[PDB]
Write a structure and sequence with these properties.
Chain B: This is Major capsid protein. This is part of a larger assembly, with 2 copies of chain A and 3 copies of chain B. By secondary structure, chain A is an alpha+beta fold. Chain A has helices spanning 6-20, 51-61, 66-79, 84-95, 118-131, 135-149, 254-272, 290-304, 357-368, 380-397, 402-411, 416-422, 434-455, 465-471, 477-490; strands at 37-41, 106-107, 151-155, 171-172, 178-185, 202-205, 211-212, 215-216, 223-226, 231-235, 277-284, 309-311, 316-317, 342-345, 428-429. Strand 11 of chain A pairs parallel with strand 13 (327-334) of chain D.
Chain lengths: 492, 104, 52, 492, 52
């Protein structure tokens, strides 16, 4: 494709080949769990370079990506509405946590290390990974975009002449312009059951030449093929009823979010219309040609029309005198002894509701936005919510594992085998709201003390002190010995 | 070529054809024949004799009037069949009696 | 018996049913003498039609 | 008959031969309550390995999966619907609990074992199985799908040239891409009861030919027969009123989920339609051929139409200026004295609710999702729910126990006979949230402490200290003696 | 369809490409009737060219 990606191709081609070397065969369905859109291809003997690409590019490009565009557009439109904005804010706030002079996302390398100093190298790289996002200042925004859009992608930079020192700051890719694909690179007797290596690369789309609310978009119109190694990315493990139609967390609320604002708007238009007085004059203009017939109607209007309008700039009636009528005296000069020329009034903006149904709908929406029921101590709802946030962080986390292994491998700090054994678990942790974290511990302590207090009369009779520490205070034995030793020291 | 959907995948034939298929080495080989073992020839137990080369489903036409075979194609779908049978009503029992003489 | 081993069935839910079919047809008017099927399995495609 | 699966074909055939040597004969029964579809074959047909192709073709005209597809597609949408989705989330959350510096479901071999070396190997193998499934990261997703779909399947991978060592990671098979079948290999003098081993194999399929929203472009073409032994699977003990139709946990919601949706939308439509002002103008255009009559109508409607629009992006009225009239004064005319020209005003989506029905149905629905009524201390409802969660866990778990058996057996660590003797019980224990566990135990202890305290005055007179320790504190005899030993030493 | 790997492709990023060939020649004049290609497989070497 382009030599521009040569260092990545080297990484991607090797990974592909190593995967092919494993006979993961006799597998009917392609070995795909989630993510990328596969395009079945076939090959003569082993591969059909650029033949497959023609068929793949056109076969996947034409019938596709419309859905992706719509989902993103929808999610942004959703985000821009009242209380969605807040729900997103709350998630982002809880998900990306930092405070004055405290911890930030951090690489907790507490597991076995190579010698063991590799940890210093990894920690230094980690700091740069954050610097390459400017996470410490923009982390909230990167997260929000991922959460809201369901996905995020960044281009990785290689020197490329001296690639070991070449990793630079990341380049975010436009939403709706990324197609993640896989190829089923095999065909054989009765349908391929041959190792499915796929390559797993991306297609960079360009030229979103359409429109959006109050604007137009522009780009190149080219389709660029990339192996995978070149891009840092993440996406939610959320798929709609069909295929690999990847959706966001915001997807679930699209329905009710819109019907709710629709109901609110319906109430508003209901209240607005009919608010001013309304009435039609009926006029008998018969036995005349239209040329003259119109005079009866035109006359009544010209002299008796209520030409008065409300001043909404200043609370007054526009330039009227005297200050206010006691009655509106109207009259008609009847052409005959018949009630044919008259005024027929219409109903006003009556207080029909009971504008309460809307309360059910809003309640339902708040919840639907993935927020605690209590938002408009310790509870199951909070614990549940916190677990959700933690999982969002885990999904997002790849953004710091990917560029990390990338430069460690590009530079010559870590080998592929070492990465594979370290992780496993090199989990990047995050800070949690300190107020609530301390509160949680405080509540725990109070309960533990109350239990100890009640237990107390028998701590020297039925339950030992060590046992009480282990069951009442939920202490480990090492913890118990440490507490006893510190007490002994203090006692002297 | 004729259907555009797929090659023949079954054979229905005179028992004699089957006797031959079952007694010849159907694989790619020098030359060979012997007693029939390759397919069932016994219509007592089935119609389905076996699969020729692992490729065609072979059946016995026990009523062939002379000696013949038919080869054909059936796809994975119901539309790709050539021949259709939409039963709508089938083998529905009737039970009662005629009370005039009350026989079943 | 092997009555349906090689037969499509799609049992009807009414008597006297129907089936539809579609041919891709070229030459402007799909209904015409000499009209031709674009993906006819036996007859070859016309390469001049989209070209010279 | 694909040789590609020979390693498992061999396992199934050996099992079958062992069944052939068993005397569990003279059985009218299909020998199965919940499992594979029933078919019959002659023994002479069955004798050929290609009988599978033949039976597959028969089964193709009684598709099986078509029904399961309709059920699953329904289940997928129920999961997708708000106030269904969340119940599933809570269930999944409790079924598989994750925490920092905490274990995950693990194999607890505290029961009789053939050997401690095997024990060590099995524990490591169990871990490799979880690693293969990426359980530590995706265990809850696999579970969710299982709960909703009623089942999960996975394709096993064997080298197969070194099928002791080349044991590779599972490929999740999506329900609807697979069916479980069983054949009667026998005939007799009207009513065969001859040993029916059945083999119980699987058939692979897939189809995107039918309607899809997106992301679906594949079809199995021919179907593939897979040895039982080649598939890891689990399913809930939930079946239909007939056959072998496997039912998901949300099947209960099929009725009320949609009843609620139906009512909700009806309420919304009711409220929106007829919310804004609606009115019909009438013009007396009589004694004209029709096209001519219209001129009179146009002479009125082109002046009467209130060509004003409500802006829902910004709450404004388009073409309103000046700010707002005190009244809407219209003039309508007639060519005779006949009161025919007029304007009608129309309803009026009145605030009739009494929005109580939708609420009753929502509560009923929510309960139907197998959740506590306390959801939107420790109670019977919570305990009942926990029992439910364990029931789910103990069916799901086949997903780990099956490959555990297979891998150990292939390696040559265990024999099948040994497997059958050890299990019995090689229970894998699931992690449960320690927060709630602590609360439960603490409450239990509080009550026990209070009982002890109250008993105290006659603990040395009518009942003993031992009595209280075993009856109130619910200690075992060993527990009492050991606890005392520790107390006595602490007292020194 | 038949794969296009039965032939070369050289897809282009522009219309109208060109191909250059380097034909080794002999007989003191690159452009002449009778001039010959040094490595044309149909013909043997001119066995006496540098010789008799």
């Amino acid at each position: 494709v382009l030599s521009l990606f040569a260092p990545w191709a080297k990484m991607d081609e090797r990974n592909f080949k190593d995967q092919e070397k494993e006979d993961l065969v006799s597998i009917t369905a392609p070995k795909l769990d989630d993510g990328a859109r596969e395009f079945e291809v076939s090959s003569n003997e082993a591969a059909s370079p650029y033949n497959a690409a023609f068929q793949t590019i056109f076969g996947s490009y034409e019938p596709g990506m419309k859905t992706t565009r719509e989902l993103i557009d929808t999610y942004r439109n959703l985000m821009n509405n009242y209380e969605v904005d807040n729900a997103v804010s709350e998630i982002v706030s809880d998900a990306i946590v930092y405070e004055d002079d405290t911890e930030v996302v951090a690489l907790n390398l507490d597991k076995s290390k190579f010698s063991p100093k590799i940890k210093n190298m990894m920690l230094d790289e980690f700091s740069d990974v954050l610097n390459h996002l400017s996470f410490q200042r923009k982390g909230s925004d990167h997260f929000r975009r991922w959460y809201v859009d369901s996905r995020i992608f960044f281009h990785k930079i290689i020197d490329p002449k001296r690639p070991k020192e070449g990793i630079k700051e990341l380049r975010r890719l436009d939403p709706r312009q990324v197609q993640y694909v896989r190829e089923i690179i095999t065909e054989t007797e009765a349908g391929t059951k041959i190792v499915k290596g796929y390559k797993e690369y991306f297609i960079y789309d360009t030229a979103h030449e359409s429109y959006a609310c109050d604007g137009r978009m522009y780009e190149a119109g080219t389709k660029i093929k990339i192996p995978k190694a070149a891009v840092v990315y993440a996406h939610s493990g959320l798929v709609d009823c069909c295929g690999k139609n990847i959706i966001g967390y915001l997807h679930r609320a699209v329905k009710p979010a819109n019907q709710l604002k629709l109901l609110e708007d319906a109430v508003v238009i209901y209240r607005i219309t009919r608010a001013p007085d309304r009435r039609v004059w009926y006029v008998d203009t018969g036995n005349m040609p239209a040329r003259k017939a119109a005079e009866h109607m035109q006359h009544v209007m010209n002299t008796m029309k209520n030409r008065v309008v409300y001043d909404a700039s200043t609370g007054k009636i526009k330039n009227q005198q005297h200050n206010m009528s006691m009655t509106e005296d109207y009259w008609l000069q009847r052409r005959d002894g018949k009630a044919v020329t008259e005024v027929d009034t219409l109903p006003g903006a009556d207080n029909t509701g009971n504008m309460e149904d809307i309360r059910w709908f809003r309640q339902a929406l708040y919840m639907a936005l993935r927020v605690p029921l209590s938002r408009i101590s310790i509870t199951r709802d909070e614990l549940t919510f916190a677990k959700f946030i933690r999982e969002l962080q885990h999904k997002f986390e790849e953004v710091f594992l990917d560029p990390l292994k990338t430069n460690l491998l590009l530079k010559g700090i870590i080998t592929e085998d070492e990465w594979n054994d370290e992780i496993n678990n090199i989990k990047i942790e995050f800070h949690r709201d300190s107020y609530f974290a301390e509160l949680k511990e405080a509540e725990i302590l109070e309960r533990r003390i109350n239990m100890l207090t009640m237990a107390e009369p028998f701590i020297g009779k039925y339950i030992s002190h060590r046992t009480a520490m282990k069951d009442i205070l939920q202490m480990t034995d090492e913890e118990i010995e440490q507490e006893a030793k510190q007490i002994e020291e203090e006692s002297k | 070529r004729q259907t555009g959907r797929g090659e023949g995948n079954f054979i229905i034939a005179s028992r004699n054809v089957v006797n031959v298929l079952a007694s010849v080495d159907t694989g790619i080989s020098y030359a060979a024949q012997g007693l029939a073992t390759g397919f069932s020839t016994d219509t007592t137990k089935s119609v389905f004799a076996g699969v020729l080369g692992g490729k065609y489903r072979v059946y016995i036409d026990q009523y062939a009037k002379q000696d013949y075979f038919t080869v054909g194609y059936k796809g994975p779908n119901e539309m790709d069949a050539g021949i259709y049978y939409a039963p709508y009503v089938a083998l529905t029992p009737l039970r009662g009696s005629d009370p005039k003489n009350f026989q079943p | 018996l092997i009555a349906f081993d090689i037969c499509g069935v799609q049992p009807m839910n009414s008597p006297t049913g129907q089936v539809f079919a579609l041919r891709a047809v070229y030459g402007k008017d799909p209904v015409a003498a000499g009209a031709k099927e674009a993906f006819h399995p036996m007859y070859g495609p016309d390469a001049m039609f989209s070209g010279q």
